[PDB]
Amino acid sequence: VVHDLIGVGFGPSNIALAIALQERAQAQGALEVLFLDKQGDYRWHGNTLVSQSELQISFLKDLVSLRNPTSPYSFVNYLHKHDRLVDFINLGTFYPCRMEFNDYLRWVASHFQEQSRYGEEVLRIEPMLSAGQVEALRVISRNADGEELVRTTRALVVSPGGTPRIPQVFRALKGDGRVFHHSQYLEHMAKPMKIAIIGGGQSAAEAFIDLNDSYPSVQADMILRASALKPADDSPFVNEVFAPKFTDLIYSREHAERERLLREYHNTNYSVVDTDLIERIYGVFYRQKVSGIPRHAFRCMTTVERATATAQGIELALRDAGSGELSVETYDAVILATGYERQLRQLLEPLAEYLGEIGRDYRLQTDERCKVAIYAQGFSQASHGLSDTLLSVLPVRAEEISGSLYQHLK
Ligand SMILES: Cc1cc2nc3c(=O)[nH]c(=O)nc-3n(C[C@H](O)[C@H](O)[C@H](O)COP(=O)(O)OP(=O)(O)OC[C@H]3O[C@@H](n4cnc5c(N)ncnc54)[C@H](O)[C@@H]3O)c2cc1C
Numbered sequence: 001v002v003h004d005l006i007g008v009g010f011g012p013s014n015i016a017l018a019i020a021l022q023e024r025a026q027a028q029g030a031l032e033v034l035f036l037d038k039q040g041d042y043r044w045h046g047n048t049l050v051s052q053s054e055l056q057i058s059f060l061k062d063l064v065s066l067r068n069p070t071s072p073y074s075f076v077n078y079l080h081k082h083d084r085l086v087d088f089i090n091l092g093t094f095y096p097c098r099m100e101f102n103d104y105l106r107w108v109a110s111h112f113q114e115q116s117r118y119g120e121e122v123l124r125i126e127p128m129l130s131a132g133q134v135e136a137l138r139v140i141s142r143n144a145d146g147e148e149l150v151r152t153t154r155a156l157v158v159s160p161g162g163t164p165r166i167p168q169v170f171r172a173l174k175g176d177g178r179v180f181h182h183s184q185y186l187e188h189m190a191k192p193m194k195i196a197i198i199g200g201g202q203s204a205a206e207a208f209i210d211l212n213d214s215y216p217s218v219q220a221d222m223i224l225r226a227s228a229l230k231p232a233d234d235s236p237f238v239n240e241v242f243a244p245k246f247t248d249l250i251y252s253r254e255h256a257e258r259e260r261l262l263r264e265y266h267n268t269n270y271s272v273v274d275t276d277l278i279e280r281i282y283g284v285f286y287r288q289k290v291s292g293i294p295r296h297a298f299r300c301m302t303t304v305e306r307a308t309a310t311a312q313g314i315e316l317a318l319r320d321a322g323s324g325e326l327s328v329e330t331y332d333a334v335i336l337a338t339g340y341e342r343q344l345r346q347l348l349e350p351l352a353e354y355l356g357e358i359g360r361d362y363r364l365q366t367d368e369r370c371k372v373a374i375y376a377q378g379f380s381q382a383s384h385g386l387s388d389t390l391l392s393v394l395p396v397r398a399e400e401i402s403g404s405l406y407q408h409l410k
């Protein structure tokens with residue numbers, strides 16, 4: 001009945017953690033562990049897996065290799081197990097398609113069937129009081145059939161990923177199927193049509209290229225408030241900001257200096273597009289100048305000031321900061337390629353009375369009444385750096401959280 005650890009989510013963060021726990025098991029004893037994921041059939045951002053979607057990190061930053069290249073869960077071992085390693089080598093790329101990395105993640109996760117529970121959404125975590133002290137946590141979940149489940153645990157790891165960021169102007173249109181966040185792209189995309197894409201980062205660029213390449217009757221407008229698509233910085237000195245060593249460095253810094261570092265290196269990860277994809281998009285617009293056929297529009301320096309549902313489509317009032325002018329365009333669909341927030345608090349709401357920043361070891365600081373350990377993954381960019389929301393340091397974070405957990409449970 002009483003688990004050692006329950007995890008919210010079984011994406012890369014918690015899969016990497018399950019591996020690190022398994023490595024420690026022989027020397028330190030196997031723990032009683034469950035990871036719950038709301039997806040019935042696990043995919044890694046499955047509704048974003050368009051034909052042109054390259055991984056934006058080296059395959060060597062897989063779930064294990066930075067810690068343990070001899071792990072059977074390395075991307076290289078995965079290829080070898082699928083009789084594909086020589087073929088992959090002939091490709092000569094560090095960047096597999098995201099569809100292949102999705103297959104890799106599913107393959108790794110399929111080794112943890114005793115620990116995973118799919119189709120279970122965690123709704124809230126409650127304190128189990130015993131003589132005034134929180135000795136355990138109640139994890140309340142709902143399965144796909146709508147049944148409630150209640151489980152008990154000594155420790156919790158919260159790794160639910162981000163939530164879609166919706167600009168305020170589009171909030172009134174929640175529930176209108178014509179407006180959707182890029183995270184649901186494939187679900188909604190599944191006859192001359194006009195589609196607006198809001199944003200100018202990697203997701204907006206991928207959405208645009210997919211429309212251009214696969215939906216010949218779609219006229220796409222990239223609507224971005226910034227002046228240009230700008231390239232993602234992965235040059236090698238800059239890229240050291242993702243190294244495991246940087247985690248210690250940023251954590252050691254005072255708050256003003258942490259914020260300065262994050263501002264300085266913002267363009268390694270946010271509001272930026274892979275250089276080759278920028279060149280591809282620029283080429284699409286350049287060819288329109290050659291042909292005189294303006295299928296698509298690049299609306300830079302443009303802000304959506306109003307968005308209204310009409311019988312004819314979604315009407316957007318567009319302010320061009322270059323000219324100060326307002327125009328009105330109507331679209332058949334609007335894709336919000338506007339990224340994600342990391343906040344996660346109905347989940348942890350019943351524990352608000354006991355909470356504090358996060359520790360170096362990713363443990364939420366609680367007052368002395370709380371005897372249980374709660375960890376969170378992907379919510380600590382402010383203190384641990386730009387690797388926090390990415391695949392970048394997962395093998396090392398997994399070793400760090402798993403170490404701390406054993407130390408706590410000893
Ligand atoms: C489109 C896209 C592309 C990306 N590409 C890259 C890339 O190329 N390289 C890179 O390094 N990073 C990339 N990222 C960053 C991404 O955050 C990480 O790669 C990684 O997915 C984070 O792992 P995670 O397990 O912390 O979160 P997630 O992968 O988001 O997993 C969270 C899991 O929690 C589950 N969940 C959420 N709420 C609940 C609930 N309450 N109960 C139960 N389960 C729940 C979800 O079903 C999900 O499976 C990308 C992100 C996106 C959105």
Ligand SMILES: N[C@@H](CCCNO)C(=O)O
Pocket residue numbers: 056057058061233234239242268269390392
């Ligand atoms: N350049 C980073 C990954 C950045 C991913 N951003 O989308 C790294 O090498 O860890």
